[PDB]
């Protein structure tokens, strides 16, 4: 018998479906207070991620979760893009496992699958050589918060030597203006960071 023929035509269901809140967190001017992790529920979609791959050096592209590929291709409901600022010593803690000072008081991440958290230093962008004291974070909040919550709850610290409000002398701030400088380490450089 006889027939074969190849020519691939794969005209697709969509036409112009809305992209995503992507290129809106990757490219936002003012992120949230760190404990108020600006998770959204990223919108309906065409979240065809490739606008991911294009970007200049991230310095944190390591997909905290599934491989840094396949996100464009896989179809999940929402990746709940979080938005917050940090400085590097806190950014070190932003990873699955990897509990540390800020993922030990403020910003914790679960076992895996933190989307594809994409950190980067924001030297020129969140601190001036006046040594900016802008964005409030919580060290000595009380203790490490449980993996991946939203912490607009900035419960104050149990500092002892006193029954009244727990706070030791008075007002033990879980309100730490990130208090960094462009002349520090990047552990203490301004850091604006996108989470998924």
């Amino acid at each position: 018998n006889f027939r074969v023929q190849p020519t691939e035509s794969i005209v697709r269901f969509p036409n112009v479906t809305n992209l995503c809140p992507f290129h809106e967190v990757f490219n936002a001017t003012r992120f949230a207070s760190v404990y108020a992790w600006n998770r959204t529920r990223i919108s309906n979609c065409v979240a065809d991620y490739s606008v991911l791959y294009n970007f200049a050096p991230f310095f944190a592209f390591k997909c905290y979760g599934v491989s840094p590929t396949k996100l464009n291709d896989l179809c999940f409901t929402n990746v709940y893009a979080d938005s917050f600022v940090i400085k590097g010593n806190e950014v070190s803690q932003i990873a699955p496992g990897q509990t540390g000072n800020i993922a030990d008081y403020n910003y914790k991440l679960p076992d895996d699958f933190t989307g594809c958290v994409i950190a980067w230093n924001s030297n020129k962008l969140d601190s001036k050589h006046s040594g900016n004291y802008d964005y409030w974070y919580r060290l000595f909040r009380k203790s490490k918060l449980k993996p991946f919550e939203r912490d607009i709850s900035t419960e104050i610290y149990q500092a002892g030597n006193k029954p009244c409000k727990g706070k030791g002398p008075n007002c033990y701030f879980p309100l730490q203006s990130y208090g960094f400088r462009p002349t520090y380490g990047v552990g203490h450089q301004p850091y604006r960071v996108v989470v998924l």
Partner: antibody
Amino acid sequence: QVQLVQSGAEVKKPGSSVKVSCKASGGTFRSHVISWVRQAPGQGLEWMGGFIPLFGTTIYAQAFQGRVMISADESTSTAYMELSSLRSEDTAVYFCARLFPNGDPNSPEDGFDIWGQGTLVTV
Amino acid sequence: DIQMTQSPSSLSASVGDRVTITCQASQDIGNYLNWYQQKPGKAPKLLIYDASHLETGVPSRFSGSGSGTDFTFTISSLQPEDIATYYCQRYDDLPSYTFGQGTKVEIK
């Protein structure tokens, strides 16, 4: 008060490791998790990564992420960056600091930064 | 011009190291003294204007003082990052911008 004496300033060459030491200046190291500053030459800042000798495993530098074998042995009165697989990228003034999680209940005036001296690495 | 020079010109000093850095010009400056420091790998930074009164920024460590012929930009307490070359421009009330030579305060 506290000084966090650091090792010196020498160049190291590719493939090998760069040794530096944030040395103990009269106690005041135990809490004081000796992390590590890098300070890229003149382009930007950096954090070499440090070790967490405070009763647990170590954090590694975000920038290099896998061969930053940053060990630090506080009781021995020495810290280390222990960067195996160096090439050239260093060319920097890697500092030892009392990086943010490193205050004492003493010395609050040297609050959350007791910096070091610096180490010029290059090729 | 008064053709700005500083005289101490190369005060070598590590952390703290009770500091004296003075932009004594050829002649007197009155209240027309800039004291500069340059941040390497970047654009310069003018910390202090006439004899004192540091800019918002470049913290108090680099501290302006001295009122006479020689105006003293002493550091109370530097740290390893305060490696910064201490030249000094002189804001002349009509622009003349005579900078300095560099009195770098060091670390080991």
